[PDB]
Amino acid sequence: IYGRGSLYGYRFDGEIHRQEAQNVILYKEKEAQEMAVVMEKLEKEIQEWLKTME
């Protein structure tokens, strides 16, 4: 009780707080999915620009 700071039970436990890990997994999947597309676009642009000028 003294260490928790709560007289009833722990806090930040529960599916409302546990689900955030799975939300992070999905968010990271989406973020990498979009970042790969953006990196491919930028790489195509750079490979065009350099070999046209350089």
């Binding site: 709560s6 007289l7 009833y8 722990y10 806090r11």
Partner: protein
Amino acid sequence: SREAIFMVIEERHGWDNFKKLSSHQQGVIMQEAAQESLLARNKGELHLP
């Protein structure tokens, strides 16, 4: 007291949502429900039928 507590909870908040919350907020709402039931504002503060 548990019966009245969970009656109040399932009427006001819901048992599934209550299960989703933390043990601390669970206890907070349980204590509020226990107070609501002990008071019995609708029975004229009387635990009789």
